[PDB]
Amino acid sequence: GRICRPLLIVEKQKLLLKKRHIDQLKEREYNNYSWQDLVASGVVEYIDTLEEETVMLAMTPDDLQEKEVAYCSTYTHCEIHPSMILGVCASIIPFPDHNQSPRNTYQSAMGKQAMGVYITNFHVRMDTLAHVLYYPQKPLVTTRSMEYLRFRELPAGINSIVAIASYTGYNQEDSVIMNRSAVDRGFFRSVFYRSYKEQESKKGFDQEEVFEKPTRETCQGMRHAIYDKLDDDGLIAPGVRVSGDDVIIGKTVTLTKRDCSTFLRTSETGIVDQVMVTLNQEGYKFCKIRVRSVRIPQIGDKFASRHGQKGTCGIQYRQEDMPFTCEGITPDIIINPHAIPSRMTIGHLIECLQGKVSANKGEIGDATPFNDAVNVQKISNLLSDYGYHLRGNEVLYNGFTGRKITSQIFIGPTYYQRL
Amino acid sequence: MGKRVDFSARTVITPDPNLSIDQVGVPRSIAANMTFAEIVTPFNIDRLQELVRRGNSQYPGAKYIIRDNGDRIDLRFHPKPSDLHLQTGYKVERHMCDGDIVIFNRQPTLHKMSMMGHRVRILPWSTFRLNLSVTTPYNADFDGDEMNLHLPQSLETRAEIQELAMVPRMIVTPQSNRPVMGIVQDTLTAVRKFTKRDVFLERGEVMNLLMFLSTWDGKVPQPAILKPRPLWTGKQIFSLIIPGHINCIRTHSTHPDDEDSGPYKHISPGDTKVVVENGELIMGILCKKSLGTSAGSLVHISYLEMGHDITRLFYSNIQTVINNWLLIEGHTIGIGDSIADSKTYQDIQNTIKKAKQDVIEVIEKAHNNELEPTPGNTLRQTFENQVNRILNDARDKTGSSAQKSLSEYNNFKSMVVSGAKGSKINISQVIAVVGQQNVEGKRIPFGFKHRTLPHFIKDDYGPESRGFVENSYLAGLTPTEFFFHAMGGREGLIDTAVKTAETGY
Amino acid sequence: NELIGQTVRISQGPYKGYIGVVKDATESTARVELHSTCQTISVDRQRLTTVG
Amino acid sequence: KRITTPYMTKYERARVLGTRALQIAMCAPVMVELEGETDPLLIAMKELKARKIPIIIRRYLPDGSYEDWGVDELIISD
Amino acid sequence: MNAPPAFESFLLFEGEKKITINKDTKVPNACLFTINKEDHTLGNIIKSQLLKDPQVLFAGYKVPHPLEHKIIIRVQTTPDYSPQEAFTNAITDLISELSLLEERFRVAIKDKQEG
Amino acid sequence: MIIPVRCFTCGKIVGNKWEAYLGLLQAEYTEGDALDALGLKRYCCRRMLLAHVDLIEKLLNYAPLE
Amino acid sequence: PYANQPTVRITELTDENVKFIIENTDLAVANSIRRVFIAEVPIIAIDWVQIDANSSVLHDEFIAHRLGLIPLTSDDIVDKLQYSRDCTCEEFCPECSVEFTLDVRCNEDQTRHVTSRDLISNSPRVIPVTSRQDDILIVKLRKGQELRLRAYAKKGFGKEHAKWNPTAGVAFEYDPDNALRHTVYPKPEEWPKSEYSELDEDESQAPYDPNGKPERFYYNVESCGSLRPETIVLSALSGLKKKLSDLQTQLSHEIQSD
Amino acid sequence: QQPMIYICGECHTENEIKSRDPIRCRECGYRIMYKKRTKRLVVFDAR
RNA sequence: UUCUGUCUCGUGCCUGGUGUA
Ligand SMILES: [Mg+2]
Ligand SMILES: [Zn+2]
Ligand SMILES: [Zn+2]
Ligand SMILES: [Zn+2]
């Protein structure tokens, strides 16, 4: 139960990790050199919190082991990479060191509510409350630590052209305007699967439960539902459109017989995806039915960013109505500028700028927090090489009148999530 | 004392500036579900007569017919045509429709203005839309909030709600005699930008903005500039919005204190000192000082002079005309608003380095016992006070230098001087330096044995060793001070979680 | 009543070429739940054709 | 020889429009010409403004006494 | 569940007038034209064309609520020329402008291909 | 899951370009030159192929419920 | 008072896009013409899909959606077809639709790419953009998976659903140099020159022009392959001309209807 | 007039399972079974 | 100067966990 972490060893002002280890480690596909050999060679060590009170720890060797006037000069360990202090949800945040810490916490909380393909065998699982995006995407700007989270293979969100502008007043007070045309094209479209489980039983000497199409000539207690939607099996068929108060499993319990069927939850309105029939531990018939429902993103749906920018869709406009740049680029989501100044999510802005360079350069940008080699000015110098304003602004034309709006709008790709 | 009530709905709230401040945009399904028993009477028997024929299926229809003997007839089952007949003493439970009075609540009902009554306007897309200015009363942002709608079920109750709890009647609160609804958030920024002295509009643009005044009398004002080209000033259009003949004097946020003493007292160089006479804006720029929820604000005068209806319109007009001009002006925030021109960065760095040297000198004096313990305080406490003073001076001075370097087009400044969102301290933290991170009022404690992290050396009372974040949010935080910033921010979350249970009791 | 629960195609008006099952039916109008959309519209029974 | 305030409290006005509207909904005769509106609340309001509502407010005092005030006797606020 | 079908932005219901004129009461010679089932595609061109008329004192439009399929163009002209004809003419000749553009674009296209 | 048919922002067809893009990347093209080869000039369209993850290739690993 | 005299000048014309410049027209007219290019220009797109059998890993609605987004070659049939809702025939007919069929089953060991080449069409003029380069991938199928469906393509326009939008990207722009100061730059020299800037590399923006209207509206209409890019512009003009002719009809009637 | 055809799990082979029958595959005896797609009309807008 | 339609509002609960403002 002692919680500990690996650290590099420092014997004099020098790491024990020399280039030969990195080279052998780089080849670990051919030769099976691995972490075990790194530990066995005595280059890495697991320090525990109680042991960490007596270790002198550098953060980065390349600066904290040279000197001008000696600060420590007796380091014993060195951090592998300081970004390893973050957890699973906190290390998908790009530029978390440019954000106010509560924003990082709120993103850690919302990163567990963002829809995406939650597992590759989702069509096999009869899970309750499953949500999968039509077209989830890899973030254009990633931390190097989300490679181990395998987020690149099972992502939860879509890179959207975010325009941080107060447009027509519905992108207001934490809400976001969305592009109806983008939605039509499947932007943030997801399918929601709900699963209903039901099992038959020997209630007793006198009463028994069985799956059968209830019939009014024999079943008492029937309701207004259309039982005819059921086939003689007594189970709804895959591919049948259902709605609130529709019977899903025609269970009847003998007394002539009482209608004990299970109905679709009120106001769900889905299509039966698949129906599986089997036996439970007790050897009685048991069936799990999964009903899919396509959820086109509408007004009121909560969308969040990787920086803590929760917001509901205030209104949706057609592409003809959205503001457009010198070319036909309209934003997919317009977010209120007043969300930034008080919450100080500058990492949001830096993401929106580097995602722009990422989409132009044709490379996924790196937003690992403590980089020191990635600062705003260098990104801007990159961005101005692609014929853009170095700070990311653009000249938007009003979608309703076609007249340029006197303020140049900050716009660029930002990885938005659907909660 | 608290029950579950019929005729109640709940939905995610979303913004809608085109609704009047006393209107709520309920979705179609809720309006189709909730009913109001309307007594049958000769004045309306025909309206209800056909309404009843429509049944429960079509939206502008009815759900039940309650006969005078109490026998309820369910219209969901399309009963025999003989039962559909209604006479004077019966009640028709028609569906909720436009104009119906509803009382709208957010569950942390902290004060009287948390359950204001609104007129319904049915709209598509499943959400309870409400006007922006009503955000402050309910404290209800639109990031996913939900609010309860209660539909009164009798005329005696609708009348009571309409005459006691209607939204415009709740503009001013007895809690502090000031307004609680004001021009807030985005439209305050837009109206500040719109009422500047250098805002000019063509005939083509004003004739379009006047389309959005409801109370406009229809006569275009003589433009403040006739030649070489007809030009209207922003204040000229805004005078059309101010209702009746109001008379107040307010001051804009950036008003110099030494301006009222020198010359240019009644003719301010910077266009501060809002002056509204005879219902016209003579000078000044509008911000939270004059349009916000503050005593003596312009909306406060409008409410005290004009009734609550003319002020209801004044609110809606400000929002609609200013948001319509915001499509021309536009407003944003981006990286260009955080960069500091590389001249102010030199000042920031020099100030922070000098402050660090001062803290080092104080530490040397303390270690040499040259530091005298001040009255009441101990030696260690006087040392902590000395260091906190030096680092507070550093942060404040760097922030102040950041303020003066911002261009007039900077969108942080536009959102701070308007008062809509943010403070100069946020600009300081974003641009110049974040500052000291405190937990329980003290610098970061020695969690390990005599040090804050394994990366520092024992007995290190320096700035970065105890939590002073010397970088800005634009430049990024060093990992040690990243963790210290996390420690400092955790206090806000803990206080938020524990305070609610103590204050609710 | 008569065609409740049958599969109907809408042959006229804005919803032309839509498939839905019937959930309510009066002498003049019927409520059709559409197979594609998550909605149940009221339509005039003269606009409906039965596919079964 | 009445001492209560000669003005109609917002509560009195509210409960009067509420009750009088309900009576109109039950077709008690209306005291003023309907130009043709039919919402009982709008009619009750019109009455009030014309000061024709046939209601007297029985105002109880803390000691147990009471004073009947015709709606036409006291002053409306709005 | 409450999504409006997309057709409601352009398909006419039973009873809907394509256009409804009402005189404005606050000033002489001013009408309110209410287009049903239309938006800014038609509102900006008519508003701008009305402004070229030297006899048009005021011309502009609003969408009373964006989810309401109704727009309001307001016109007010000199007393010697009714707003009705102001509208009529500004469309009478706007149609000509678009036809003139069609003819001129058609010739420029045939002139670009092998020319 | 599968490459989107059209770019969400503008509407350019990009559904016919994922296989081509994979072939270009099979050659030593840098993804920026690959995108230029496929004719994707606007960053909204480039975002589609740079950020797309082909999960349908994983979903096909499962035997079908024929 | 009367109509202004507009001009046109095509600078580039390809089978993918048109760059043209419009002179002597209002700011509103040039933007409304843009809006028509996006929303109000009819094209043929799949709007009805009967899925006979689908066992692929993609769901029935997923398939339907993707089929809806496939661009069809709509150049002569679209101006001749009647809107389905306006058509008098029950169900579908050639006068209001183009029938499509896709019956596919994977039996070979390798995975089958169900591209748009499998979308057979009842008409030779309306087909996915495959005339004369890879095809839109609809599904990937394993051994034993199948997809058999019937579909009908309807005449529609981008205001109802994005599927009927004939453009990939419309680049509307006017006044490249900031002569009218319709946009105010905090630092005009940080901004790259427009493609149409008649400006030397010395000065940043054109000197302020107080009395001046916007003319010379530069367009770059890029097609999605459905309509030829010049036919999109012609289709806008005929459709807007019809909208005004019909609106004047309704208006004139409403004047007499007093 | 269908004997109620089901699809096996690990086999993927159609088996006829009537009421009052234990769900067992005809071959290998797997207990998991799936109902085959409906024959009813399936039509989508493709939107 | 053989009959025959006759169907109309059913319902768990506790406890614990996670989540929303
Ligand atoms: Mg909130
Ligand atoms: Zn694109
Ligand atoms: Zn036809
Ligand atoms: Zn088997």
mmCIF file of N, CA, C and O in Angstrom, chain B residues 326-363:
data_model
loop_
_atom_site.group_PDB
_atom_site.id
_atom_site.type_symbol
_atom_site.label_atom_id
_atom_site.label_comp_id
_atom_site.label_asym_id
_atom_site.label_seq_id
_atom_site.Cartn_x
_atom_site.Cartn_y
_atom_site.Cartn_z
ATOM 1 N N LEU B 326 -24.232 45.379 -32.134
ATOM 2 C CA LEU B 326 -23.096 44.490 -31.921
ATOM 3 C C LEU B 326 -22.832 43.580 -33.118
ATOM 4 O O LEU B 326 -21.757 42.977 -33.191
ATOM 5 N N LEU B 327 -23.787 43.449 -34.046
ATOM 6 C CA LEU B 327 -23.527 42.716 -35.283
ATOM 7 C C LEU B 327 -22.650 43.513 -36.236
ATOM 8 O O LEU B 327 -21.985 42.924 -37.095
ATOM 9 N N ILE B 328 -22.643 44.833 -36.100
ATOM 10 C CA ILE B 328 -21.778 45.701 -36.888
ATOM 11 C C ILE B 328 -20.439 45.884 -36.195
ATOM 12 O O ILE B 328 -19.381 45.704 -36.801
ATOM 13 N N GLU B 329 -20.470 46.239 -34.910
ATOM 14 C CA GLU B 329 -19.232 46.485 -34.178
ATOM 15 C C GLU B 329 -18.439 45.195 -33.994
ATOM 16 O O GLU B 329 -17.228 45.160 -34.235
ATOM 17 N N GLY B 330 -19.105 44.125 -33.568
ATOM 18 C CA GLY B 330 -18.425 42.887 -33.239
ATOM 19 C C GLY B 330 -17.591 43.003 -31.981
ATOM 20 O O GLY B 330 -17.149 44.096 -31.615
ATOM 21 N N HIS B 331 -17.367 41.875 -31.309
ATOM 22 C CA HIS B 331 -16.558 41.846 -30.100
ATOM 23 C C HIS B 331 -15.983 40.450 -29.899
ATOM 24 O O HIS B 331 -16.653 39.452 -30.172
ATOM 25 N N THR B 332 -14.741 40.395 -29.419
ATOM 26 C CA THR B 332 -14.005 39.146 -29.291
ATOM 27 C C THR B 332 -12.966 39.263 -28.186
ATOM 28 O O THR B 332 -12.804 40.313 -27.559
ATOM 29 N N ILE B 333 -12.268 38.156 -27.948
ATOM 30 C CA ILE B 333 -11.079 38.126 -27.107
ATOM 31 C C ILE B 333 -10.176 37.020 -27.629
ATOM 32 O O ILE B 333 -10.650 35.952 -28.030
ATOM 33 N N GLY B 334 -8.875 37.274 -27.623
ATOM 34 C CA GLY B 334 -7.935 36.324 -28.169
ATOM 35 C C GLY B 334 -6.547 36.540 -27.611
ATOM 36 O O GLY B 334 -6.350 37.270 -26.639
ATOM 37 N N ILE B 335 -5.581 35.883 -28.253
ATOM 38 C CA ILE B 335 -4.194 35.968 -27.814
ATOM 39 C C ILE B 335 -3.659 37.384 -27.978
ATOM 40 O O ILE B 335 -2.823 37.832 -27.185
ATOM 41 N N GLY B 336 -4.091 38.098 -29.018
ATOM 42 C CA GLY B 336 -3.623 39.458 -29.223
ATOM 43 C C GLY B 336 -3.949 40.398 -28.079
ATOM 44 O O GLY B 336 -3.299 41.439 -27.940
ATOM 45 N N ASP B 337 -4.941 40.056 -27.257
ATOM 46 C CA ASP B 337 -5.290 40.853 -26.087
ATOM 47 C C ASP B 337 -4.435 40.532 -24.868
ATOM 48 O O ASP B 337 -4.547 41.226 -23.853
ATOM 49 N N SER B 338 -3.602 39.494 -24.935
ATOM 50 C CA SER B 338 -2.747 39.105 -23.825
ATOM 51 C C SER B 338 -1.288 39.481 -24.045
ATOM 52 O O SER B 338 -0.555 39.642 -23.064
ATOM 53 N N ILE B 339 -0.856 39.621 -25.299
ATOM 54 C CA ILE B 339 0.522 39.988 -25.597
ATOM 55 C C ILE B 339 0.776 41.410 -25.115
ATOM 56 O O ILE B 339 -0.113 42.272 -25.176
ATOM 57 N N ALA B 340 1.991 41.668 -24.632
ATOM 58 C CA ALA B 340 2.335 42.960 -24.045
ATOM 59 C C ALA B 340 3.561 43.576 -24.709
ATOM 60 O O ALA B 340 4.458 44.090 -24.035
ATOM 61 N N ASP B 341 3.609 43.540 -26.044
ATOM 62 C CA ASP B 341 4.435 44.435 -26.857
ATOM 63 C C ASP B 341 5.943 44.380 -26.591
ATOM 64 O O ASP B 341 6.699 45.140 -27.204
ATOM 65 N N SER B 342 6.394 43.512 -25.683
ATOM 66 C CA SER B 342 7.819 43.285 -25.439
ATOM 67 C C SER B 342 8.544 44.472 -24.807
ATOM 68 O O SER B 342 9.725 44.359 -24.464
ATOM 69 N N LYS B 343 7.865 45.607 -24.645
ATOM 70 C CA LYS B 343 8.404 46.686 -23.826
ATOM 71 C C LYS B 343 7.952 46.548 -22.380
ATOM 72 O O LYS B 343 8.749 46.734 -21.454
ATOM 73 N N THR B 344 6.674 46.223 -22.179
ATOM 74 C CA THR B 344 6.147 46.015 -20.835
ATOM 75 C C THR B 344 6.708 44.747 -20.206
ATOM 76 O O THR B 344 6.795 44.654 -18.977
ATOM 77 N N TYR B 345 7.083 43.761 -21.024
ATOM 78 C CA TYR B 345 7.688 42.548 -20.487
ATOM 79 C C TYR B 345 9.028 42.841 -19.821
ATOM 80 O O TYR B 345 9.357 42.246 -18.789
ATOM 81 N N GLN B 346 9.806 43.769 -20.379
ATOM 82 C CA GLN B 346 11.052 44.155 -19.723
ATOM 83 C C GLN B 346 10.782 44.747 -18.347
ATOM 84 O O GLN B 346 11.465 44.411 -17.371
ATOM 85 N N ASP B 347 9.776 45.617 -18.245
ATOM 86 C CA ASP B 347 9.420 46.189 -16.950
ATOM 87 C C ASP B 347 8.953 45.107 -15.984
ATOM 88 O O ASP B 347 9.331 45.112 -14.807
ATOM 89 N N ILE B 348 8.133 44.171 -16.462
ATOM 90 C CA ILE B 348 7.658 43.081 -15.611
ATOM 91 C C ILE B 348 8.840 42.295 -15.053
ATOM 92 O O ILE B 348 8.935 42.049 -13.842
ATOM 93 N N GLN B 349 9.758 41.891 -15.934
ATOM 94 C CA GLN B 349 10.908 41.103 -15.500
ATOM 95 C C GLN B 349 11.765 41.880 -14.508
ATOM 96 O O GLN B 349 12.180 41.333 -13.479
ATOM 97 N N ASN B 350 12.040 43.155 -14.792
ATOM 98 C CA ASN B 350 12.887 43.935 -13.895
ATOM 99 C C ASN B 350 12.233 44.093 -12.527
ATOM 100 O O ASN B 350 12.898 43.958 -11.492
ATOM 101 N N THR B 351 10.929 44.379 -12.500
ATOM 102 C CA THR B 351 10.231 44.541 -11.229
ATOM 103 C C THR B 351 10.256 43.249 -10.422
ATOM 104 O O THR B 351 10.521 43.267 -9.212
ATOM 105 N N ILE B 352 9.996 42.113 -11.075
ATOM 106 C CA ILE B 352 9.986 40.840 -10.360
ATOM 107 C C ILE B 352 11.378 40.502 -9.832
ATOM 108 O O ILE B 352 11.525 40.018 -8.702
ATOM 109 N N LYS B 353 12.419 40.760 -10.626
ATOM 110 C CA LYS B 353 13.781 40.484 -10.172
ATOM 111 C C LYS B 353 14.176 41.374 -8.996
ATOM 112 O O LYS B 353 14.797 40.903 -8.032
ATOM 113 N N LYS B 354 13.808 42.657 -9.040
ATOM 114 C CA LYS B 354 14.091 43.538 -7.911
ATOM 115 C C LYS B 354 13.342 43.086 -6.660
ATOM 116 O O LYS B 354 13.891 43.122 -5.551
ATOM 117 N N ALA B 355 12.087 42.663 -6.814
ATOM 118 C CA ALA B 355 11.320 42.185 -5.665
ATOM 119 C C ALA B 355 11.952 40.930 -5.067
ATOM 120 O O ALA B 355 12.010 40.773 -3.839
ATOM 121 N N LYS B 356 12.427 40.024 -5.923
ATOM 122 C CA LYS B 356 13.119 38.829 -5.450
ATOM 123 C C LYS B 356 14.393 39.186 -4.691
ATOM 124 O O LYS B 356 14.684 38.603 -3.637
ATOM 125 N N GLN B 357 15.153 40.161 -5.193
ATOM 126 C CA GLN B 357 16.330 40.625 -4.462
ATOM 127 C C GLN B 357 15.948 41.211 -3.104
ATOM 128 O O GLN B 357 16.648 40.993 -2.107
ATOM 129 N N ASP B 358 14.854 41.972 -3.045
ATOM 130 C CA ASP B 358 14.427 42.539 -1.766
ATOM 131 C C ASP B 358 14.060 41.439 -0.772
ATOM 132 O O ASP B 358 14.416 41.514 0.413
ATOM 133 N N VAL B 359 13.343 40.411 -1.233
ATOM 134 C CA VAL B 359 12.991 39.304 -0.344
ATOM 135 C C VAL B 359 14.251 38.600 0.143
ATOM 136 O O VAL B 359 14.345 38.193 1.308
ATOM 137 N N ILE B 360 15.235 38.437 -0.742
ATOM 138 C CA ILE B 360 16.498 37.812 -0.353
ATOM 139 C C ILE B 360 17.199 38.638 0.723
ATOM 140 O O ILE B 360 17.749 38.088 1.684
ATOM 141 N N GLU B 361 17.223 39.962 0.563
ATOM 142 C CA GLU B 361 17.819 40.827 1.582
ATOM 143 C C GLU B 361 17.091 40.708 2.920
ATOM 144 O O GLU B 361 17.728 40.682 3.983
ATOM 145 N N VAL B 362 15.760 40.632 2.893
ATOM 146 C CA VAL B 362 14.996 40.454 4.131
ATOM 147 C C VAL B 362 15.338 39.116 4.782
ATOM 148 O O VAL B 362 15.458 39.018 6.010
ATOM 149 N N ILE B 363 15.505 38.072 3.973
ATOM 150 C CA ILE B 363 15.895 36.762 4.495
ATOM 151 C C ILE B 363 17.288 36.818 5.116
ATOM 152 O O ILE B 363 17.532 36.218 6.167
#
